Write a protein that binds this ligand. Structure first.
Ligand code: ANP
Ligand code: CL
Ligand code: CL
Ligand code: MG
Length: 282
């Protein structure tokens, strides 16, 4: 069933067909990280010496959890996207045991690692990330695609330090049929998923507000000691700002963290926000 609506043809990374991708086309390097069902390796295409990232998923693990359909959604959606702030999925291929994803290589790693080293981000670095993320989110929503898994671990950094969305393992194409699945990461779950209501593209707006908070504070706003307490604080929208948070950021985060999904602003309003337009570098 590993036949996706996504490229699997060999790509000549030196110009501008018939042969398909194969593991013999790539030199493998150190692993960039471990995933849900397999590591992600730094790789190099042999003919062009082009550096990219190879995400390996073992077919045996995906069937124990029954996530073959979400992998189909991940590969088919991401491979048809073209945006500077979105990680490229050049193609895929598979053998008897594994499924391979030929991903764009982000040289500067994850935003998550930059946040661990700097503890918290300044306002300019935050506003620029939010602008780059909202731009890529607006491109996704223009194709009726909801990411539904916005978190620092899924935000990578390109050559110029620009932000690029990664990991579409929970994304979905919802043109009008609005979805129902409880999915994502705990601290970034929107209220409509915890309370069992049907959600739309406004869940990326909520996770954007949670992300802007953690960028400035260093901890997500609804962080708790258990899943039990985190569920309540997200449902109540129970969070407070430290004193060093400015009124401009205090306004944007509060606008994005509305319990009512319809009251959360549009991505254009986030891009035109006074706090953004004042501190964003892009
Ligand atoms: N193109 C890339 N460049 C550099 N590192 C990457 C790249 N793709 C993935 N990684 C690394 O792999 C990690 C995530 O891999 P992935 O297989 O998507 O995990 P996951 O199972 O989807 N869940 P999560 O690890 O939380 O994102 C990132 O945090 C990076 O450390
Ligand atoms: Cl800065
Ligand atoms: Cl506490
Ligand atoms: Mg994934």
């Amino acid at each position: 069933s590993y036949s996706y609506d996504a490229p699997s043809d060999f790509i000549n990374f030196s110009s501008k067909k018939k042969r398909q991708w194969a593991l013999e086309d790539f030199e493998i390097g150190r692993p960039l990280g471990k995933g849900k069902f397999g590591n992600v390796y730094l790789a190099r295409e042999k003919q062009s010496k082009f550096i990219l990232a190879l995400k390996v998923l073992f077919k045996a693990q995906l069937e124990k959890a029954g996530v073959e359909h979400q992998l189909r959604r991940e590969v088919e959606i991401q491979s048809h996207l073209r945006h500077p702030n979105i990680l490229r999925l050049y193609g895929y291929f598979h053998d008897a045991t594994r499924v391979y994803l030929i991903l764009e290589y982000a040289p500067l790693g994850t935003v998550y690692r930059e946040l661990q080293k700097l503890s918290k981000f300044d306002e300019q670095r935050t506003a620029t990330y939010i602008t780059e993320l909202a731009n890529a989110l607006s491109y996704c929503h223009s194709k009726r695609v909801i990411h539904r898994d916005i978190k620092p671990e899924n935000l990578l950094l390109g050559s110029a330090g620009e932000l690029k969305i990664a990991d579409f393992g929970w994304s979905v194409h919802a043109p009008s049929s609005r979805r129902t699945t409880l999915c994502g990461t705990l601290d970034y779950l929107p209220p409509e998923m915890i309370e069992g209501r049907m959600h739309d593209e406004k869940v990326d707006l909520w996770s954007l507000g949670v992300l802007c908070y953690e960028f400035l504070v260093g901890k997500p706003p609804f962080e708790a000691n258990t899943y039990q307490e985190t569920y309540k604080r997200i449902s109540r929208v129970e969070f407070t700002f430290p004193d060093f948070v400015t009124e401009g950021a205090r306004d944007l985060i509060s606008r994005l963290l509305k319990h009512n999904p319809s009251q959360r602003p549009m991505l254009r309003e986030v891009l035109e926000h006074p706090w953004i337009t004042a501190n964003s570098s892009k």
